[PDB]
Amino acid sequence: SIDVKYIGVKSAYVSYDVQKRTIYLNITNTLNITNNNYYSVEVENITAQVQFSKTVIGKARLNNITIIGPLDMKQIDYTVPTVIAEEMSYMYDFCTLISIKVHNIVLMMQVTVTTTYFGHSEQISQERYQYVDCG
Amino acid sequence: SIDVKYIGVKSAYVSYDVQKRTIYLNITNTLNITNNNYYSVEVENITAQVQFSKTVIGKARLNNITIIGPLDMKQIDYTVPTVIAEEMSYMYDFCTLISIKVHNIVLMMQVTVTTTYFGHSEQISQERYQYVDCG
Amino acid sequence: SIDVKYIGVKSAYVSYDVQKRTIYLNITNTLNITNNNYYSVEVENITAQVQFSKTVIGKARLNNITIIGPLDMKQIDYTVPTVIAEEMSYMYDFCTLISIKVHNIVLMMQVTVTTTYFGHSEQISQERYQYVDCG
Ligand SMILES: *[C@@H]1O[C@H](CO)[C@@H](O)[C@H](O)[C@H]1NC(C)=O
Ligand SMILES: *[C@@H]1O[C@H](CO)[C@@H](O)[C@H](O)[C@H]1NC(C)=O
Ligand SMILES: *[C@@H]1O[C@H](CO)[C@@H](O)[C@H](O)[C@H]1NC(C)=O
Ligand SMILES: *[C@@H]1O[C@H](CO)[C@@H](O)[C@H](O)[C@H]1NC(C)=O
Numbered sequence: 001s002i003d004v005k006y007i008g009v010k011s012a013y014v015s016y017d018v019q020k021r022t023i024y025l026n027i028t029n030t031l032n033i034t035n036n037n038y039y040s041v042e043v044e045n046i047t048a049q050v051q052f053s054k055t056v057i058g059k060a061r062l063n064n065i066t067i068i069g070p071l072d073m074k075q076i077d078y079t080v081p082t083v084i085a086e087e088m089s090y091m092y093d094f095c096t097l098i099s100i101k102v103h104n105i106v107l108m109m110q111v112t113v114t115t116t117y118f119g120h121s122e123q124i125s126q127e128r129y130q131y132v133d134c135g
Numbered sequence: 136s137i138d139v140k141y142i143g144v145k146s147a148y149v150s151y152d153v154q155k156r157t158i159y160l161n162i163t164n165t166l167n168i169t170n171n172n173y174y175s176v177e178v179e180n181i182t183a184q185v186q187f188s189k190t191v192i193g194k195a196r197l198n199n200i201t202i203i204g205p206l207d208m209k210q211i212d213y214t215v216p217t218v219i220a221e222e223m224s225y226m227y228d229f230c231t232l233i234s235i236k237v238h239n240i241v242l243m244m245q246v247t248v249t250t251t252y253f254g255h256s257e258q259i260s261q262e263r264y265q266y267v268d269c270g
Numbered sequence: 271s272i273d274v275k276y277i278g279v280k281s282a283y284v285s286y287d288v289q290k291r292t293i294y295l296n297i298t299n300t301l302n303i304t305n306n307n308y309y310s311v312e313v314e315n316i317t318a319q320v321q322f323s324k325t326v327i328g329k330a331r332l333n334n335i336t337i338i339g340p341l342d343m344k345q346i347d348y349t350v351p352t353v354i355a356e357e358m359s360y361m362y363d364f365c366t367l368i369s370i371k372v373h374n375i376v377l378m379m380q381v382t383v384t385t386t387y388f389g390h391s392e393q394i395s396q397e398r399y400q401y402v403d404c405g
């Protein structure tokens with residue numbers, strides 16, 4: 001990337017800013033901007049790019065071959081009992097939460113077994129997480 | 136990318152901004168912008184790009200071959216009992232939640248077994264997560 | 271990257287900023303900006319790039335072959351009993367949470383078994399985590 005910005009509230013290239021209880025009297029503003037942005041970005045010049053994959057087997061014997069790629073999800077148990085009894089009680093559960101593995105962002109890129117590539121790979125993430133607000 | 140912006144509330148290239156209880160009297164504004172943006176971005180020049188995949192087998196013997204790619208989802212148990220009894224109670228569940236793996240964003244890109252590629256791969260994510268607001 | 275910015279509240283290339291209880295009287299502003307930005311960024315010049323993968327087997331004997339890539343998820347147990355009884359009680363659970371492995375951002379890039387590549391790989395993350403706010 002070139003210019004990544006995280007902004008709290010306000011972005012202003014020029015900000016003539018006024019707020020509460022202000023006497024804005026007798027002001028003279030003269031402003032000139034000559035803004036130039038010039039970009040020559042990610043330019044590629046290749047005369048020759050060769051990509052070659054070759055597998056050769058000559059009368060061989062193969063047995064018990066197992067190939068498993070990344071992210072091998074197997075045989076998991078989740079158990080969350082919630083056994084609640086009462087005897088003459090006043091229950092006040094205002095903001096109570098039960099969350100099993102809640103996901104927000106899952107960006108999977110280049111997850112394979114055999115891979116050959118040429119070039120550029122780029123991932124950008126912005127957010128404002130707030131999980132819980134209870135008053 | 137070139138220009139990624141996360142903005143809190145306001146973006147303004149020029150902001151003549153006024154708010155509450157303001158006496159905006161006798162103001163003279165003169166403003167000139169000469170804004171130039173020039174882009175030559177991701178330009179490719181290739182004379183020769185070769186992509187070649189070859190598999191050759193000569194009278195070989197193959198047995199018990201298993202190939203499994205990424206993301207192998209198998210044999211999972213989720214158990215969330217919720218056993219609730221009462222005896223003479225006042226229940227007040229105002230903002231109570233039970234969530235099993237709630238997903239927001241799942242961006243899968245290039246998830247295979249065998250892969251060959253040339254070029255550019257790009258992912259951009261913005262959001263404003265707030266899960267729960269209870270008053 | 272070139273310019274990564276984390277901003278608290280406000281970003282302003284020029285900020286003529288006024289707030290509460292201000293007497294802005296008799297002000298004369300003269301402002302000139304000649305702003306030039308020149309970028310020649312990630313430019314590649316390759317005459318020859320060769321990528322070659324070759325596997326050759328000559329009448330060999332293969333058995334009990336197991337290949338497993340990264341992220342091998344197997345055989346996990348989670349058990350979170352919640353056994354609650356009462357006898358004549360006043361329950362006040364205002365902001366109480368139970369979270370098992372809640373995920374926000376999972377960026378997976380280049381997770382394979384065999385990999386060959388040429389180029390640029392880039393990941394950018396901004397956020398404002400706040401998990402819980404209870405008043
Ligand atoms: C604002 O400017 C004018 C002209 O220059 C002047 O007559 C006036 O008195 C000024 N205002 C104040 C409050 O001085
Ligand atoms: C910008 O405008 C002001 C206004 O008078 C002038 O004096 C200045 O020469 C200008 N500059 C350019 C680069 O145009
Ligand atoms: C790519 O094009 C030609 C071929 O090599 C080269 O002369 C030129 O300078 C390159 N372009 C850039 C922007 O570098
Ligand atoms: C491995 O080979 C033996 C006998 O050759 C067979 O019993 C077994 O099932 C094989 N393994 C798998 C995972 O199939």
Ligand SMILES: *[C@@H]1O[C@H](CO)[C@@H](O)[C@H](O)[C@H]1NC(C)=O
Pocket residue numbers: 160161
């Ligand atoms: C605003 O400007 C005019 C002309 O310059 C002037 O007559 C007037 O008095 C000014 N206002 C104030 C409040 O001074």
Ligand SMILES: *[C@@H]1O[C@H](CO)[C@@H](O)[C@H](O)[C@H]1NC(C)=O
Pocket residue numbers: 032034165166167168169
């Ligand atoms: C912009 O406008 C102002 C207004 O008077 C002028 O003085 C200045 O020369 C101008 N600049 C350009 C670059 O046009």
Ligand SMILES: *[C@@H]1O[C@H](CO)[C@@H](O)[C@H](O)[C@H]1NC(C)=O
Pocket residue numbers: 043175178179180
């Ligand atoms: C691509 O086109 C020709 C062929 O190589 C080259 O001369 C030129 O400079 C390249 N273009 C750019 C924008 O670099």
Ligand SMILES: *[C@@H]1O[C@H](CO)[C@@H](O)[C@H](O)[C@H]1NC(C)=O
Pocket residue numbers: 064199201
């Ligand atoms: C592996 O081979 C054995 C005997 O050759 C067979 O019993 C078994 O089922 C094979 N494995 C699989 C996964 O089929």
Ligand SMILES: *[C@@H]1O[C@H](CO)[C@@H](O)[C@H](O)[C@H]1NC(C)=O
Pocket residue numbers: 026295296
């Ligand atoms: C503001 O400027 C004008 C002209 O220069 C002047 O007459 C006036 O008295 C000034 N204001 C104050 C409060 O002095």
Ligand SMILES: *[C@@H]1O[C@H](CO)[C@@H](O)[C@H](O)[C@H]1NC(C)=O
Pocket residue numbers: 032300301302303304
């Ligand atoms: C910018 O504007 C001011 C306004 O008078 C002028 O004096 C100065 O020469 C200008 N500079 C350029 C580079 O345009």
Ligand SMILES: *[C@@H]1O[C@H](CO)[C@@H](O)[C@H](O)[C@H]1NC(C)=O
Pocket residue numbers: 045310313314315
């Ligand atoms: C790439 O293009 C030609 C070929 O080598 C070279 O002369 C030129 O200087 C390069 N471009 C840049 C921007 O370096």
Ligand SMILES: *[C@@H]1O[C@H](CO)[C@@H](O)[C@H](O)[C@H]1NC(C)=O
Pocket residue numbers: 064334336
């Ligand atoms: C390894 O080989 C033995 C006998 O050759 C077989 O019993 C066993 O199942 C093999 N292992 C696997 C994981 O298949």
